Design a protein around this nucleic acid. Sequence first.
RNA 1: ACCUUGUUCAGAACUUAAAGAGAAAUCUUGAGUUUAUGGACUUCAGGGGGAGUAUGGUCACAAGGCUGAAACUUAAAGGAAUUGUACACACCGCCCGUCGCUCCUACCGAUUGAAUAAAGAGGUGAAAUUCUAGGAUUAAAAAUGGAUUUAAAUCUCCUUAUUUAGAGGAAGGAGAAGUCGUAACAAGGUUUCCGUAGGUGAACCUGCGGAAGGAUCAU
RNA 2: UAUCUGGUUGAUCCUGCCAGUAUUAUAUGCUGAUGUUAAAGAUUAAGCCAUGCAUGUGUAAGUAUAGGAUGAAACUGCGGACGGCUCAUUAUAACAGUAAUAGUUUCUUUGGUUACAAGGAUAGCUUUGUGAAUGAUAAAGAUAAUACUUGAGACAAUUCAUUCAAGUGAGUUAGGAUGCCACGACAAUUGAGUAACCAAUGAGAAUUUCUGAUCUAUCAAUCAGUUGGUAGUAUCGAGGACUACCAAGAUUAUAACGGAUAACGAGGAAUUGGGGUUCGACAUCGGAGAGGGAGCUUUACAGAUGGCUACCACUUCUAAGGAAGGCAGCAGGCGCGUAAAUUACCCACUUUCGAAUUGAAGAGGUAGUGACGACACAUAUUGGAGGGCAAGUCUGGUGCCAGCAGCCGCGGUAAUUCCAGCUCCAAUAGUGUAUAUUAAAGUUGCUGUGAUUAAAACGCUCGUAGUUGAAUUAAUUACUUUGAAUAAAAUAAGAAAGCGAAUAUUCAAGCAUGGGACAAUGC
RNA 3: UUGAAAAAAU
RNA 4: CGACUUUUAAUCG
Lengths: 41, 98, 91, 86
Amino acid sequence: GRCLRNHSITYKTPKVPYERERFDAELKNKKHMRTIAKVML
Amino acid sequence: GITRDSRHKRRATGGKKNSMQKKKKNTMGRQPANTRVHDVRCRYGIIKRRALRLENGNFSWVYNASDNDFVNTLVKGAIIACISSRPGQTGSVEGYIL
Amino acid sequence: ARGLHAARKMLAQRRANKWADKEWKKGKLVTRYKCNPLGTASHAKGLETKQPNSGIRKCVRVRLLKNGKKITAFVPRDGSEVLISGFGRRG
Amino acid sequence: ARGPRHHLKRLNAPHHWMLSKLGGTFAPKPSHGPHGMKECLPTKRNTAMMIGGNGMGRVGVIVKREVHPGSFEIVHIKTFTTRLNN
RNA sequence: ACCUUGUUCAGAACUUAAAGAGAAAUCUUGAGUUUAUGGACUUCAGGGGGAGUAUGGUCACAAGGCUGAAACUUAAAGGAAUUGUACACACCGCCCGUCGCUCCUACCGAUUGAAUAAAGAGGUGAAAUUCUAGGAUUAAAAAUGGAUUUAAAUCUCCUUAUUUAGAGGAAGGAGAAGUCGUAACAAGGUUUCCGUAGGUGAACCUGCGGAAGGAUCAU
RNA sequence: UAUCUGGUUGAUCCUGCCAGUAUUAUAUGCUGAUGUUAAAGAUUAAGCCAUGCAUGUGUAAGUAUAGGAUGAAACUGCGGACGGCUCAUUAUAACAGUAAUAGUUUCUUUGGUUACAAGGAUAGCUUUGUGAAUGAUAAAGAUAAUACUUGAGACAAUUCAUUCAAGUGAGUUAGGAUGCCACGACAAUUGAGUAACCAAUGAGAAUUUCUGAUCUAUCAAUCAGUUGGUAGUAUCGAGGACUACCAAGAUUAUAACGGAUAACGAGGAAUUGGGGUUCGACAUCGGAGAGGGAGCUUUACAGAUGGCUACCACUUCUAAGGAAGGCAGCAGGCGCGUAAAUUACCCACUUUCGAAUUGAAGAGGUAGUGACGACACAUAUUGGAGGGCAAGUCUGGUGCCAGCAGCCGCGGUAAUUCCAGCUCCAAUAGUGUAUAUUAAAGUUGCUGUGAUUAAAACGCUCGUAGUUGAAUUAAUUACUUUGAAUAAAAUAAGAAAGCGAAUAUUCAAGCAUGGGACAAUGC
RNA sequence: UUGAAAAAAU
RNA sequence: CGACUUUUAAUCG
Ligand SMILES: NC[C@@H]1O[C@H](O[C@H]2[C@@H](O)[C@H](O[C@@H]3[C@@H](O)[C@H](N)C[C@H](N)[C@H]3O[C@H]3O[C@H](CO)[C@@H](O)[C@H](O)[C@H]3N)O[C@@H]2CO)[C@H](N)[C@@H](O)[C@@H]1O
């Protein structure tokens, strides 16, 4: 390890870079519990 | 000098061990001062009475089982009576009449 | 083998068959330290086309500081110690 | 180590001392005495008291005491189980 | 007994399939019961070349067999189908091998080819210690001598990795239009291919024996 | 998000790979308004080091004419064996978990027990000096001790031989008794200090039990102190650890012995539908090292190297006779390389050491550089416009040339791909490029692949090891269920952050337990 | 009975 | 040098 202080990522870029059905829907900039529900169901 | 660790011996299969460190003081060995009385500062500060040579001896009521060559070194179990103390460690010869 | 106690063969079988892998083997045997001009490094400081395409590719020959081997290097753009870093395809 | 250790690290300190992980690089080393390093402090962890394992902080009365000559012996308390030393 | 019928096994096959499987050709006594994925076990394969080549090991009298890489090179190579077809610019097609010309890569290497860095046995051996002798000095105790122990450092043969090497070389690979032939794809004009042996500028040719992936499922 | 798309053909369906994609961490190209957090000479050279600091310490209670408390120096005491750095070693070695020490054990701390004072010398003090000088040393004259001794107020534990003998699963065991040896006190101390022993601290240190590691047969046989036995030695202590005698034994296809690593191991990290693959020098635990070996000193602990000694290899001062040193501590210089910051301040946090509440600490904190990264957040760049893949069938030149293109390919004078100009496309203070890890990859297959023709069933049979082995019955092991026990950090969990979660892990082993259907071992 | 060949890319 | 061809490659003077 390198540091005692924790850190996290607050987003994840999509797998497919260019898809029209996503460019329109998403359009300042373009910058969990479902599975938690899943595991108990 | 003399070490007593098993880092230089082989394995039960005959393998040669490979060095990963150097000699450490906790494996100290010492030159056997044959009792044909000094003191040695052992670990933890205790003292060992190293009897270099000695002739008198307490006993209670010609042959060495280990090495015939020793026949006049004084060691435990030697016949002279049979010595029962460790003269090289305790610093005196204590034996019993056969 | 499929039985419950035959974990020795399938472990052994897989180890043998991995060596057939061109990509996997290249990363384990000793050529990335003696045959790769770049070694394992990214960049390296140093000092006519195929049939259906005609023209001339301007290129350069470079002797590496560390290894000393001579390699052919392209020039990036139109009309274009040197740092060389591979191409699109790896190796 | 050439000799007995003197310093103590914050992380290596016992859990129940409740020391934070960012307060300071070191933690106070308990001196030798009547209580051990991990059994002292320089249910959140006859009728008896649990000082050891998972039952630490629990009070109650013993029902029976299985004994195994091999390794240890077990105490059952009104019910939870734990070794004698706890 | 031999022939004609039934019944139940073992064996070599064959016919049909609207079914099952497959990329299809086809398979059906499996190539079925496989994404609805697991009956038991052994062996082999991982794009095409370089290559069954180099090195090393081993077997044979030898030819050779068995085990067997890497460097480097390249976007395809290949399968089954839309009388045979490797053709689709469609035979005025495609394609093979030697040679000629540049460049690159590994291999060998008369030049006792070396050279360097790391591992065991034998010889020399510092120093410090254990013991011993000595006791200048003021029982203690320093120089010093001697014998053990532990042994650095060095020399001699031998065991792993990294490097320099020219006659002497010998292979492979890449680059539109360079030579000689017609080897292969149609019966490719001598059907083709495999093993082996011999000959030959080159594809290759011929002998012995197989195979159809044959141009014959057939008298 | 359990996901694919371009490319072999005139066209089709495959095998199969290349390419495309996302991500993690390294470098790097262009560009940059803030606030918070934060990596940072490891890879290449455990290569070489200029310079400065990193370990010293004083209370009423040791010694002080340098007697009021105070009081520098010096003697004496304690520590520098912790801390900090690095990962060169190392392949059952170290390490992790578990078990033992009825086979050892101090230091500190804590609890308990057991002669109205004697004797001398020594530094600082003063004096003489010496050589260039080291943390340089020589002479002489004094003076103290909680320095060094003797000495008494009166035992404690070691060795030996014999004997009586109660905890523990288990002891001729703790312990008592007999005779002997050894050692021998509770400072002849100071305004608190001390010796011997017992216990704890101690689950600790150290040895040791069981299980567990990457690739390799172009490593198949290996070992002679080797394997065991006796007796001694040596050790803090078990033991071939060693010596003498005796024996022929130990390991191996369930991979021994040997070889490679760009190998310190673990807690962990990256990525994952499940399963897995790769990394872990680097916060914390353990190990090892201080240029290379080796030999030692002091102590309670060192085979110490900011201690010594010798050799090898270097570095430095020199008045030329001599002299010291070990940055893989903090800064910093070179060399190396693609690849890594200040020759800053202070003990104020945390903690440690000290004769101690004060002193010291390049541990530690603060400040500096710092698009490594992460979180929030102004208003401008990066690449691209044929397809994959979102975006122009706009205008000028170039003419298979220059060039672009990760792949398909575009360019041979009318280019949707070149060089320009305009416009819009994705993201945005970020975005290109190269390399490598993972997913894609059901292209490594336990879940899960294929083997007629695409790569791939040994020419065939026998056969050892291995694996797999029909039905049937009213001691272990495997299996299975529960517990015990189980460092933190981290993971998940009760703006990134931070701080009491039952917080659950965390497997491989090991312990206890209910069960005996499917199994293996002999009876 | 003989019967060889067709420069590179669109 | 030109001629040739969609370009080239050669060829022909
Ligand atoms: N690939 C290695 C071997 O090459 C052999 O032969 C090689 C050459 O001898 C052969 O040469 C051909 C020639 O056949 C044909 N008749 C003429 C053609 N110009 C040559 O071509 C070759 O050489 C020229 C030289 O300028 C290069 O520019 C060209 O790129 C290259 N292919 O082309 C091959 C590639 O260099 C066998 N043809 C081949 O089967 C084998 O694989």
